[PDB]
RNA sequence: UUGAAAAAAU
RNA sequence: AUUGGAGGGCAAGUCUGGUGCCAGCAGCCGCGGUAAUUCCAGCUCCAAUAGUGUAUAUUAAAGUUGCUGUGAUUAAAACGCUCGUAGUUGAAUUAAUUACUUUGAAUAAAAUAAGGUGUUUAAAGCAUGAAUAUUCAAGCAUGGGACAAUGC
RNA sequence: ACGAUCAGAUACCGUCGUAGUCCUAACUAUAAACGAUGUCAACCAAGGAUUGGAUGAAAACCUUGUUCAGAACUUAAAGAGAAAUCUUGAGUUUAUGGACUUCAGGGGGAGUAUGGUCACAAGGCUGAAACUUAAAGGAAUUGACGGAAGGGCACACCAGGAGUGGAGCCUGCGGCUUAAUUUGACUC
RNA sequence: AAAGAAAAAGGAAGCAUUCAGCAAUAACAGGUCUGUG
C-alpha cells in the first residue's frame, strides 16, 4: 500500500487477518 | 480509434449472445447491443379514462395497464429520438 | 515460470525505490541474491537487509534510503573476458566514475572495480547505478 | 496456474514450522472411455485428450526415475 | 518609401512618431505591388480607435496619398485618433469624481 | 525596471547576487528583466523560423512561430517559443520566454580531474516527444559530435565535448532543440555518488 | 566545478529537481511526494523522530 | 530466443527475415543478369529504331523527345531520353548511341 | 414520396 | 585553369532580351499558359583545383535487418483456439569429465597500429631489423570453481 | 416472377416462390474467428460495486468484517505513448537483456502466376518476379459541408393586399441584319 | 434570487417610441485603367 508499514515485525492483529501463506512465516489455521 | 470503450454492446465475459429482432424495422440485433425500453401504458388514455367511469356496469373496476418491452436497434433507435448523439466527454454518462 | 530468481528480485528493488518505499520484500532468497546485496552494501547503496527463515527459501527485507537508481539483471550470463571489460563499461554504465558492474568468478562474487584488480573474468550477473 | 485451464488457484496445505499412486489415479481415462454410449460428446473427447497427455507426461518422467521399467506403455 | 526603405521600418518609425505625440491611435494602410507581381496589403494600428458613430467626424484626421514606384503605384492612408485636446467628450464616458 | 514580484524586487535592489541561488531553492523567475541583470551579455541564437497556419472561413491566418535559445557559454541555457503575426515581435516575444525558461546545466570531466569542466557528467536522454536525444560523456579531444541544429544549442549551454545519438523524427526542429533542452534540464536532477 | 550544491528531500533522501515547483520547505521553530497524499504522513514519520509529535503515528508504522 | 545456447534460432531468424527487403534481395536474385536490359553494365550500346515523344505527367505539360533503341548484346527495346534542348536532330537512324541508366538507382 | 452530374492545371 | 551551379536541401544574383504549359530545365520538391530568382543567351561570384561532372556497384547514415538495436490496438504486422515431439529456458539447498576464467608454449612472410631511422619534409625505404601485439575459430599443459550440462 | 418508384431500377418498398433455414451420417476449415492487444512469471496509487467459497459477530435468504479465485467499473496532479488512450498494462525501455513461439519491412502488381499438397466440388495451406509510382497510411486542431440533432432569427413562409406573367406602347438585354448597327456587366 | 416579459391608466409621444447616416476582424483573384495631368 501507499501508507508504508513495518513489515519486518508485524502487528499481532494484522497477522491474524492475512492469508495463511501470505504471512511473514506461513502458519496453518487448523487446531488439534 | 475506439469510439466506445465497450464497443457499444454490453458483453464482457461471453463470446456470443443470441440475436433479437428490432421492434421497428425488424433488424437482427444482438441482445446487449439492443436498446431496451420498458413501457407502462393504460389501455384507456387519460382523455377517456373518466368517460368509462360514467357508464361502467361494474362498481369498483380499476382499469389495467399494458406491459410491453420494446427493443430497438441503433438505426431506428436514434431515428426514433429514443437516444441522441452526445458529447465526447458526455458519452461516459451512464445514468 | 520463474526462470531467474535474481531477475525478479532486482526489479522488485528497482520498482520500490522509484515509489519511495523504505523497505521491500523479496520472497525467495538464493545464494546469489544475498551475495548481490552484499556488493551493493559496500558501495552504501543500501543500509542492510535480513533473511527470514521460512524453511522454503525465506524472504529478504532490504532497507534502502533513496540511493539506488537502477539495479537490473542481465539476460543469459555472457562470458566476460578480462580484456572485454571496457566493452561493457562504456555501454552499461552511465559514467566512468559512477556505475558498478557485478560479475561471478571462481573466487566468489565480485564487482568490476575489484575483479579487474584480482585479474579474472567470468560471467556477468547485472549492474546497479 | 493450472496446466490446461487458465485458472490460477493458490489453495494449499501449510505444513507448520516445526519438525516435532498419482499415475494410477489418472487411469479417469478409463472412466471417460462413457465415450462408447455418447459418440457425439465432443466435449468429453477433448477432455479425454488432455487426460491422455497427462498420463503420457508422468510416464515419461517416472521412467527416468526408474520407478517403471522402460517397457511401460499405456493402452486402453 | 520612395527612398526604398522597407514598409516594416519606414512606416513603423512614423507610426511610432504619431504615438508619442499625444495621439490616442493611428491607422496606416499600404497596398500595391510592394513584394511581387501579385498585390498585397497590410494595415497597422496602435492604441485605441473607434470606427462607428458620429464621433468619427469630430475625432478623425485622415489623408490619402499615392506614391508612384518603379513598378506601379502604392496607396497610403493615415487616420489618427485624436484626444481631449480637440475639446469634446466621447459618447460612452462617466469619469465620476470622488470627494 | 519597476518589478512587481518578491524575487524581482530583491534582484533589482541588489539583494541577490548570483542566479544559481534562485535555482538552488526552486524559486520561479517570473520576469525576464531579472535575467538581464544577473547574467549580462547573454548570447542570442534563433534556431529556425516556422510559419503555422490556421484555416478560417475567409482565408488562412498565417502566423510566424520563432524558436530561440539563449545562454552564456559558462553553463546556463534556455529556450522559449512564441508565435505572432509579425516576424519582428515573434523574435522579440521569444526573447522573454527564453529568458524565463533558463535552467542550470551541470558539466563534468570524462576520465581525469583536470581543469576545466568540459563534458556532461553522465548519460542523459531528453524526454521530448517522438524525438529522443541521448548525451554521452566525451573525452577532451572530440568536440560536439551532433547535428547542426542541437550543435547551435549545445554551444550556448557551454558544453564543448559530447556524443549524441538521435532517435525519432529529427526533421522536426521544434522537437529537436526541445529534446536537447530537456536533456540538459535534468542534468542536476540525476543524483550521482558525489552528491550524496 | 558545481554551479550550486543541490537541495535534498528530507522525507525520501533523494535530490530536489532544479525546477520542481511543487516542492515546499517547512521551517518550524519533493513535488512528486506531495501530489499523492504522502506528504502529510511522511512528515509525521519525520516530525516524530525529532519529537515535535509524541503519539500521533503508531510504532508499527515508524520506519 | 535470448538464451545463451539458442544461437541457431537467432541466426535462422535473421536468414529468414533478411529476404523481405526490397533492396538487398535484388542483389541475390538472378534477375539482374536476366531481366535487366543493362545487366551489370554501366553503359549499353544500341541502334535507333523509332523516334517517339512522351507527354509529361498530369501536373506538367509538353512532349519529351525520345528514341526507341535496340541493343546489340540483348536485342531488347528501350526508350531513351535525348539529353538537351533541340538535340533530337543530332541523333540519326542506325547509329551507335550510348545508353547509361538514370539518376534513380536502376 | 422523389432529389443524378459539375472537363485538366494555376 | 577548368568543371558544375547560382529557387530549397547546398554557396552564390530581389541583374536584361527572347520563348508563352510550346520549346525546355529538373537525381527529389518543382520552375514555364505573354512581368521566368530555375529554360535558351549577355555580365558577375560560389565550391574544388590538376582537377571535375556523369552512370553502376561496396560501406556509413540504416535504431530501414534490429545479439549490442526495431515494431506487432489503430500506420505493415500476434497463428481461430487447444494438445504436442525436436529446440530453447528451467525454484532453493552441500563450509569424473566438459564449459568458464588466468597464464604460458608453439605459432610463414607481406599487411593491420607502429618502436627507431630528416629519402630535403611527406608518400617512400630499412637505408640497429622495435620484445615488434596479432592465432577469431579449433587444439596442448596449467592455478579457481561462483555460475553452469552430464547420473550414481 | 409480378406490382410500385425512377429518365432508366435488372435494387431499396409490397405480394408470391425453388435451393436453403430443421435432424441424422460423411465432407469443407474459412469470418470484423476482435479485446484488431500471443503464452507463463515478479513488483504495481486510491475507491465503490458484483459472482463462488472459507472464517467471526449479528439468531437457507438478508446487514457487516478478514481472505482466495473470477467478469468488470470510477479517479489520477503519477508512468507510457505520435495522439486517441492504456493502469488486472499499451507501466517497471536510449537508465535499452525474465523465458519461449509466430508475424512485418514504402504503395501497387498480389495472396496473382508457376510448382507442391489436401477436398466429390467451390476452394484452402505454402507462394515470387517482370513492371509501375512520391507517396499510401495513423491520432488529434481549425474551417467548410450534412437529404444529422438541439437552441434562436429574417415578408422566408402561414392569414392576406397589390401585383408581374396575358394586351398596346416607352426602355434595356440576347439574337438576326449591316459599311457601322460602339462597348462594360450575365443568379441573388 | 435576477436579468427581464406581458395588460390596463396617465402621457404629445412606451416594439431600441418610428424612419434613417456612420458601421469591426478577414476575404472575392466581384465592377470601373471608357473619370481624371
UniProtKB/TrEMBL annotation, chain B:
Ranges of Basic residues composition bias in the record: 1-15
Lineage: superkingdom: Eukaryota
GO annotations of cellular component type: cytosolic small ribosomal subunit
GO molecular function: mRNA binding; structural constituent of ribosome
One GO BP annotation of this record: translation
Keywords (A to Z) from UniProt: Ribonucleoprotein, Ribosomal protein
Residue segments, region Disordered: 1-21
Similarity remark: Belongs to the eukaryotic ribosomal protein eS26 family.
Name under which the protein is recorded: 40S ribosomal protein S26
Residues of the full protein shown: 2 to 96 of 144
TrEMBL record, chain C:
GO biological process, one term: translation
PROSITE patterns listed in its UniProt record: RIBOSOMAL_S8 (PS00053)
Transmembrane segments: none
Family designation: Belongs to the universal ribosomal protein uS8 family.
InterPro entries: Ribosomal_uS8, Ribosomal_uS8_CS, Ribosomal_uS8_sf
Pfam families: Ribosomal_S8
NCBIfam families: PRK04034.1
Protein name: 40S ribosomal protein S15a, putative
SUPFAM superfamilies (alphabetical): Ribosomal protein S8
Keyword Ribosomal protein set for record: yes
GO function terms (MF aspect): structural constituent of ribosome
Assigned keywords, A-Z: Ribonucleoprotein, Ribosomal protein
Assigned GO CC terms: cytosolic small ribosomal subunit
TrEMBL record, chain G:
Presence of the UniProt keyword Cytoplasm in the record: no
InterPro entries assigned: Ribosomal_eS21, Ribosomal_eS21_sf
Entry keyword annotation includes NAD: no
Molecular functions per Gene Ontology: structural constituent of ribosome
Gene3D superfamilies: 3.30.1230.20
Keywords of the record: Ribonucleoprotein, Ribosomal protein
GO biological process annotation, one example: endonucleolytic cleavage in ITS1 to separate SSU-rRNA from 5.8S rRNA and LSU-rRNA from tricistronic rRNA transcript (SSU-rRNA, 5.8S rRNA, LSU-rRNA)
Pfam families found in the cross-reference section: Ribosomal_S21e
GO CC terms of this entry: cytosolic small ribosomal subunit
Family: Belongs to the eukaryotic ribosomal protein eS21 family.
Cited PANTHER family: 40S RIBOSOMAL PROTEIN S21 (PTHR10442)
Identification of the protein by name: 40S ribosomal protein S21
Organism field: Entamoeba histolytica (strain ATCC 30459 / HM-1:IMSS / ABRM)
TrEMBL record, chain H:
GO biological process terms held by the UniProt record: translation
Keyword vocabulary terms for this entry: Ribonucleoprotein, Ribosomal protein
Keyword Transport tagged: no
One CC-aspect GO term: ribosome
Transmembrane segments: none
Domain of life according to the entry: Eukaryota
Molecular function GO terms recorded: structural constituent of ribosome
Record-stated family: Belongs to the universal ribosomal protein uS12 family.
Protein name as catalogued: 40S ribosomal protein S23, putative
